[PDB]
Design a protein around this ligand. Structure first.
Ligand SMILES: [Fe+3]
Ligand SMILES: [Zn+2]
Lengths: 423, 581, 31, 308
């Protein structure tokens, strides 16, 4: 039943080095991660199912720190989201976004260089031009393989607030970017203008009550996208109905837990469409809810990430941990969903069997093909971990699942863990 | 003398994009010097796949490769240019691929029929069957050029390859196939169009992707023009009807945007039966964009209707919908109608225009939005020849006055631009009684741009009403501003004289306008004084030689003694230009 | 204090003049 | 000769009007001749009516073009800018270059005062240094202009009745003669009369006060009334403070603030104003909105062509 996950690799070891996003590419051969320092590191799987290890493939500075001279504020270079485009040709394309700007990066391999000169040598030593009589055209020669990353297009100056989501449309042309209050529609080949489809900004900001937390395009349908709000509701929009998507087509929201923190914990931090596209998953602070797109009134499945923290919300509020934005991700078959937790714990929920397992990404098990022992949290029998002993600084916010294989990338604060199914 | 060529060849490796770009643009010079034989064996392999991939550099490279046929040895060796262009037809940039495809089409004509089947047709197959959809996207644009000049066996293969592209998994490929479907059908035989084009056209029109379906509207126009009228009902109309009723507003927008093109293709008989009901739905579409697009086509669509029922259909079917559009909430929809609704007057005639169209004109003239009001005023010629402007005069005037006095100066600017057009239409007599006061009020407007526009407005008005009207009406009033306490307004008189002198002629300028300019030379404000020097410079040539030596020269000489530096400089310049000193 | 919605309200209150004035004092204080 | 340069200078103005930057060599030549003109000007420039008074522009070149369209083109209209020509704008280089170019060409028609942002420290913080560095690749252009700013007059006096300055009054200044005694050919000091003249602000609080900007002082109505009567001034034209309506009378019309940058920092959405002084010294105000930018705004709620 349960998948026996095994330690495969650990990479990484300061604030600048903290990983802020993780994303496999469509084929799953490439794995990209971003950090608070604006750097993007791409790992390529060894292609010698495939269980080859991942090795550094490319590294570039996606974003640089900048100062907003209009608002007189600093602009963070932290990488919020990375999205791979479908492979157009031999090269690889991905979208990298910070709070303000989205950059389209091309990663291409070069294995040849020009050789031959008419007015000088390869060393740069010139010669008298009077003696140059016969012309010769340079000829390309093989060279050691190298990977080059360059910024092709920059989408900037469009968002007044901090960008939180980017999602590529299935039409291969457009993608959306959602800030706190606006969603803008972009054309991948046009940077000078954008289309603002959704704008929930109130006339008087004093009356502000909702902010957009996440947005995503439907994997198959080109006209369907959803966006969640801080109030815990998901609005599904149909671009076919009208040019402006202010009027949502569907609204997903549920009707003993009316505590002071109910408002805070209800905010949806991440929303993910299933690969099949029939189901939708949302992650709030305490639970993962899976929504059938044909049932607005309630989710079809609900899973508790960590119930033991429900009684400790007061402590979490004091140390600001209650505002953490955890993520979630489906597996290739949509049968298992993964989400992170505290103390370097990440949770696997099997929909078919309704079984749960808690796993720890720790260097203590730093031995290849070593089975991860399921963890248990108690509020203490043998091998159980006391709730009071949990370290809330160790947060697993960002995780990714291989699109086809049982390979998962789990990012701690400073280390990236890759786990593989026992084979 | 080969050193300059060596510099260009080396610059191809230069890191500087600008220097490398310049060398690419001069590839003809490099190829010409190297020779025909060396170009094929040395230059082209270097250009076959260049590591540098700047869009501007690749775009320039694609353009040059399309004119290299002579440099490579003529048509006998034209196929040597394919590998360089095949690589360019695979890059990620769209414009580079489009240019590369254009170059391939250009050189295809120079391929002999044997060469096409030996070198060019295989190239299309490689691109069509390539693993990267960028290559397959480019392949769509190459079928039409090679199909006509190949044997029947090769033609059958090409049609099969094109069919696979229309069914490609990637929407990018399918969009290209839909775009090129119309032209490919133009070269196919009529039998294959009915048998092979239509199934592909039908399948694409029902594609899941909205961006793909909307391209089927264009293919509908192209295919309709090819098929006989009797076959349109069976083959084309079922797909066209679905497009007008498509759930996606984008698809319906294309139908509205190209409605007139559809009207010509289908013919008058189909237009009455199907298009007219479809047009009514579009004008009542829920999306504002679709309604605005339909509004632009109201005039053209009604014009093309057959005379047997044109008047009846407009009055009974189209006209009621227009009334709703006039009161449309969306600003842009109302603006679209205003620019074209005036064109229905000739079609309906005098009696119908007064009874039905005229109330609509009055309603839009009173609309709050300045754009709607401006559009109606700008297109009064369509109604002048039908019912006469006198009937509209008493209703146009209140609208003009409000526009002329709008708070936003840019709104006031817009009406000024149409003033000479209205003045001619309304006649001299009406202008003097009603519109003359408005024109003068602009000359003293706070905003300089309005005063500048009004100054040029006088010239255009004089060009129509003639010198005599200007002397009696305009000149005595503009000269009155010379005494204005504000120096900005006093300079306006000089600006008016500068433009008026070009038309008012020598006699009027010397006797009435020139004395005022000379008097202002003693103005206490330096700004006025050196504008007099500039004014004399511009109108000096129009004056007689005797006048220049008698009056203009002594005044300019005095200005050169003025304390202010600017007055002396322009005074000196005026003398030099006029050759007086 | 840490709520994103609250931050926007604060950001929209200190928008026009206050933020520039605050930084001006900071720059002057830095000297 | 001067004629050849004058034609060359005219060509620069036409090029600048098109928002095209001058070359580094051209800028250096322009600045050198600008200093020769400015050095001869007193700390209290004597300006003659009629003239149009303008406030901060902050490198909003397209809005500067709007200002000319409203007030007229130089040299036909006499202008008096009260500083803050750079920073917080995409076109600070073009904005300052055009104004400096006009000053050299039409020294008698246009007067440019020194604003607080005309300082080496401020320009490096608020983007003018970056704009020059990005548009030229080196700091030479920034070095030239910052040196030129030192020669800009601190204040101007119009017909001996209207006193124009960027910041406002100072505790250390009681008569215009004190202003004339200052040495302005230096970097904006952090303290003293020169600093106050460029950083002070009017305030409702009576008397002097602590400036929230961290520099200068805040002066109440009583200070303004005493200063005007002492120097026989009718009005104190003032800049350096954002106002939504473009101009804002204060202190019983003893002080007027003029702001000439519409939609300040492309975000405020304020109105800009310019004060026109008639030949008889009577004052009038013209309010204008931001110039319609070509192909903008980038973000629109109307469907773009690529999606239509
Ligand atoms: Fe200032
Ligand atoms: Zn300022």
């Amino acid at each position: 039943n349960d998948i026996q996950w095994c330690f495969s690799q650990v990479k990484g070891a300061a604030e600048a080095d903290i990983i802020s996003t993780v994303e496999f590419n469509h084929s799953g051969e490439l794995l990209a991660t971003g950090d608070k320092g604006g750097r993007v590191v791409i790992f390529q799987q060894e292609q010698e199912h495939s269980r080859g290890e991942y090795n550094v493939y490319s590294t570039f500075q996606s974003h640089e720190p900048e100062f907003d001279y209009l608002k007189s504020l600093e602009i963070e270079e932290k990488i919020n989201k990375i999205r791979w485009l479908p492979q157009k040709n031999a090269a690889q394309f991905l979208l990298s976004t910070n709070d303000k700007t989205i950059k389209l990066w091309k990663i291409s391999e070069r294995d040849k260089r020009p050789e031959g000169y008419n007015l000088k040598e390869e060393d740069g030593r010139y010669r008298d031009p009077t003696t140059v009589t016969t012309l010769r055209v340079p000829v390309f020669r093989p060279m050691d393989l190298m990977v080059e990353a360059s910024p092709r297009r920059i989408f900037a100056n469009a968002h007044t607030y901090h960008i939180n989501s980017i999602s590529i449309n299935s039409d291969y042309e457009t993608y959306l970017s959602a800030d706190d209050l606006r969603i803008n529609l972009w054309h991948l080949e046009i940077t000078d203008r954008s289309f603002n489809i959704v704008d929930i900004k109130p006339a008087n900001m004093e009356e502000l009550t909702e902010v957009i937390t996440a947005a995503e395009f439907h994997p198959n349908s080109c006209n369907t996208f959803v966006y969640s709000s801080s109030k815990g509701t998901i609005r599904l929009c149909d671009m076919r109905a009208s040019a402006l998507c202010d009027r949502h087509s569907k609204l997903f929201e549920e009707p003993s837990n009316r505590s002071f923190f109910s408002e805070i914990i209800s905010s949806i931090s991440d929303v993910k469409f299933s690969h099949s596209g029939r189901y939708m998953m949302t992650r709030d602070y305490l639970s993962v809810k899976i929504w059938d797109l044909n049932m607005e009134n309630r989710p079809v499945e609900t899973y508790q990430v960590h119930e033991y923290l429900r009684s400790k919300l007061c402590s979490l509020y004091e140390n600001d941990c209650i505002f953490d934005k955890f993520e979630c991700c489906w597996n290739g078959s949509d049968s298992v969903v993964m989400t992170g937790s505290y103390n370097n714990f990440f949770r696997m929920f099997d929909r078919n069997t309704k079984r749960d397992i808690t796993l720890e990404a720790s260097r203590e098990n730093n031995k290849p093909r070593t089975v991860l022992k399921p963890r248990k949290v108690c509020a203490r029998k043998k091998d159980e971990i006391s709730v009071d002993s949990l370290d809330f600084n160790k947060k697993i916010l960002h995780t990714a699942w291989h699109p086809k294989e049982n390979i998962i990338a789990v990012a701690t604060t400073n280390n990236l863990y890759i786990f593989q199914d026992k084979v | 003398s080969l050193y300059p060529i060596a510099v260009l060849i080396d610059e191809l490796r230069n890191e500087d994009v600008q220097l490398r770009l310049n060398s690419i643009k001069k590839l003809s010079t490099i190829a010409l010097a190297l020779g025909v034989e060396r170009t094929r064996s040395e230059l082209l392999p270097f250009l076959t796949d260049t590591i540098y991939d700047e869009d501007e550099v690749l775009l320039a490279l694609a353009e040059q490769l399309g004119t290299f046929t002579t440099l490579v040895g003529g048509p006998e060796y034209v196929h040597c240019l394919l590998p360089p262009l095949e690589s360019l037809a695979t890059v990620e940039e769209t414009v580079v691929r489009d240019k590369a495809v254009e170059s391939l089409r250009a050189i295809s004509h120079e391929h002999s029929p044997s060469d096409l089947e030996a070198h060019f047709v295989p190239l299309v197959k490689r691109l069509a069957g390539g693993d990267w959809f960028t290559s397959r996207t480019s392949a769509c644009g190459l079928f039409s050029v090679c199909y006509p000049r190949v044997s029947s066996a090769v033609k059958a293969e090409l049609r099969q390859y094109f069919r696979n592209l229309c069914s490609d998994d990637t929407p990018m490929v399918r969009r290209a196939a839909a775009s090129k479907l119309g032209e490919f059908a133009k070269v196919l035989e009529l039998d294959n169009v009915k048998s092979e084009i239509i199934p592909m056209f039908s399948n694409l029109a029902s594609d899941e992707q909205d961006s793909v379906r909307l391209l089927a509207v264009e293919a509908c126009v192209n295919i309709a023009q090819l098929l006989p009228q009797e076959d349109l009902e069976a083959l084309v109309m079922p797909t066209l009807r679905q497009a007008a009723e498509d759930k996606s507003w984008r698809v319906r927008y294309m139908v509205a945007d190209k409605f007139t093109e559809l009207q010509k293709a289908v013919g008058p008989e189909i237009t009455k039966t199907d298009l007219v009901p479809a047009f009514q739905n579009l004008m009542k579409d829920c999306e504002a964009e679709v309604r605005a697009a339909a509004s632009h086509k109201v005039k053209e669509f009604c014009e093309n209707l057959s005379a047997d029922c044109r008047e009846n259909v407009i009055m009974s079917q189209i006209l009621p919908c227009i009334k709703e559009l006039v009161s449309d909430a969306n600003q842009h929809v109302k603006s679209a109608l205003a620019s074209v609704i005036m064109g229905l007057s000739p079609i309906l005639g005098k009696d119908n225009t007064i009874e039905h169209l005229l109330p609509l004109f009055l309603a839009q003239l009173k609309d709050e939005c300045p754009e709607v009001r401006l559009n109606i005023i700008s297109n009064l010629d369509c109604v002048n020849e039908v019912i006469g402007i006198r009937q509209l005069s008493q209703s146009l005037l209140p609208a003009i006055v409000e526009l002329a006095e709008d708070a936003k100066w840019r709104v006031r600017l817009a009406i000024i631009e149409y003033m000479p057009l209205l003045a001619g239409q309304l006649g001299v007599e009406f202008f003097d009684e009603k519109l003359n006061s408005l024109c003068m009020a602009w000359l003293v407007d706070h905003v300089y741009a309005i005063r500048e526009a009004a100054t040029s407005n006088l010239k255009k008005l004089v060009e129509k009403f003639g010198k005599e009207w200007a002397h009696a009406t305009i000149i005595p009033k503009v000269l009155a501003m010379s005494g204005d306490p504000n120096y900005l307004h006093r300079m306006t008189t000089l600006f008016c004289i500068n433009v008026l002198s070009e038309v008012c002629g020598q006699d009027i300028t010397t006797k009435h306008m020139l004395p005022t300019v000379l008097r202002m030379a003693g103005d206490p404000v330096a700004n006025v004084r050196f504008n007099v020097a500039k004014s004399l410079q511009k109108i000096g040539p129009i004056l007689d030689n005797s006048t220049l030596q008698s009056e203009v020269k002594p005044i300019l000489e005095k200005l050169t003694q003025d304390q202010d530096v600017d007055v002396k400089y322009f005074a000196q310049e005026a003398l030099t230009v006029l050759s007086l000193a | 204090h840490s709520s994103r919605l609250h931050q926007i309200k604060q950001e929209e209150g200190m928008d026009l003049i206050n933020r520039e004035t605050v930084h001006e004092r900071e720059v002057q204080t830095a000297m | 000769d001067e004629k050849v340069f004058t034609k060359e200078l005219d060509q620069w103005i036409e090029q600048l009007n098109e928002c095209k930057q001058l070359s580094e060599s051209q800028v250096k030549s322009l600045c050198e001749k600008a200093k020769e003109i400015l050095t001869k000007e007193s700390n209290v420039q004597e300006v003659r009516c009629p003239v149009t008074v303008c406030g901060d522009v902050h490198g909003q070149f397209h809005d500067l073009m709007e200002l000319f369209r409203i007030g007229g083109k130089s040299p036909d209209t006499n202008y008096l800018f009260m500083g803050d020509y750079v920073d917080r704008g995409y076109y600070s280089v073009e904005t300052v270059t055009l104004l400096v170019a006009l000053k050299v060409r039409y020294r008698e028609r246009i007067t440019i005062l020194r604003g607080n942002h005309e300082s080496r420290q401020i320009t490096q913080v608020y983007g003018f240094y970056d704009e020059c560095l990005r548009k030229y690749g080196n700091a030479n252009v920034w070095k030239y202009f910052t040196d030129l700013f030192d020669y800009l007059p601190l204040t101007a006096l119009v017909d001996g009745q209207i006193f124009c300055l960027h910041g406002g009054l100072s505790p250390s200044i009681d008569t215009l003669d004190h202003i004339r005694a200052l040495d302005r050919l230096q970097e904006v000091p952090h303290e003293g009369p020169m600093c106050d003249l460029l950083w002070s602000d009017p305030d409702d609080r009576g008397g002097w006060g602590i400036s929230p900007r961290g520099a200068g002082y805040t002066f109440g109505q009583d200070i303004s009334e005493t200063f005007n009567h002492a120097n026989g001034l009718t009005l104190v034209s003032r800049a350096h403070q954002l106002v939504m309506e473009g101009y804002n009378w204060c202190h019983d019309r003893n002080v007027v603030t003029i702001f000439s940058a519409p939609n300040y920092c492309y975000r405020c959405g304020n109105q800009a104003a310019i004060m026109e002084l008639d030949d008889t010294l009577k004052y009038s105000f013209l309010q204008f909105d931001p110039a319609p930018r070509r192909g903008e705004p980038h973000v629109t709620r109307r469907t773009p062509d690529y999606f239509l």
